[PDB]
Write a protein that binds this DNA or RNA. Structure first.
Length: 128
DNA sequence: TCATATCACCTGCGTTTCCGTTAAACTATCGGTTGCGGCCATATCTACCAGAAAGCACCGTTTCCC
């Protein structure tokens, strides 16, 4: 009922009311992905990117099946210097589907920045 | 012949989460091997010392001199 009312308010562009209703559920469960599927949109549009990335990452630990999205979670985590989290997100991208080859390259930049090259080398051989 | 509810089950499939595996860069000692220097032995040089034959000075019995 709360999730329907919050998503209805989101469709009405009543984003603060939508947030207040999603917060009634998030207060009971901080990992409630069913709220973040649209509350994350509110947080991204309002520039709350620090809270937005965490809303994706902590809930997606459980809700990992939207696998293409882990690339976006990894990218934003790296832009915010949450580098462990960025590598952990790219791991799920590659573990769920290796064919997202640009993700191997992007992850290899994190490896280049910190000297973690032994993980990049076999990956670049596969890319080549 | 498909579409719900409820209970015994038990046995079965193959699922679903934190731990285990192969092997990473970076980590904490600690070992095979590198170079560097004490105690003690020797022949020589020396400091500190006493003893003898000989110096040498303090002394007063002598007697010549005030």
């Amino acid at each position: 009922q709360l999730l329907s009312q919050a998503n209805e308010a989101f469709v009405r562009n009543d984003l603060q009311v939508a947030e207040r209703l999603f917060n009634e559920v998030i207060k009971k469960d901080a990992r409630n992905f069913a709220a973040y599927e649209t509350l994350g949109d509110i947080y991204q549009l309002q520039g709350r990117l620090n809270d937005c990335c965490n809303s994706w990452f902590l809930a997606a630990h459980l809700n990992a099946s939207d696998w293409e999205f882990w690339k976006i979670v990894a990218i934003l985590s790296a832009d915010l210097d949450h580098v462990r989290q960025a590598i952990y997100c790219f791991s799920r991208v590659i573990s769920l589907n290796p064919m997202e080859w640009e993700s191997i390259y992007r992850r290899s930049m994190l490896y280049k920045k910190t000297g973690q090259l032994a993980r990049a080398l076999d990956g670049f051989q596969r890319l080549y």
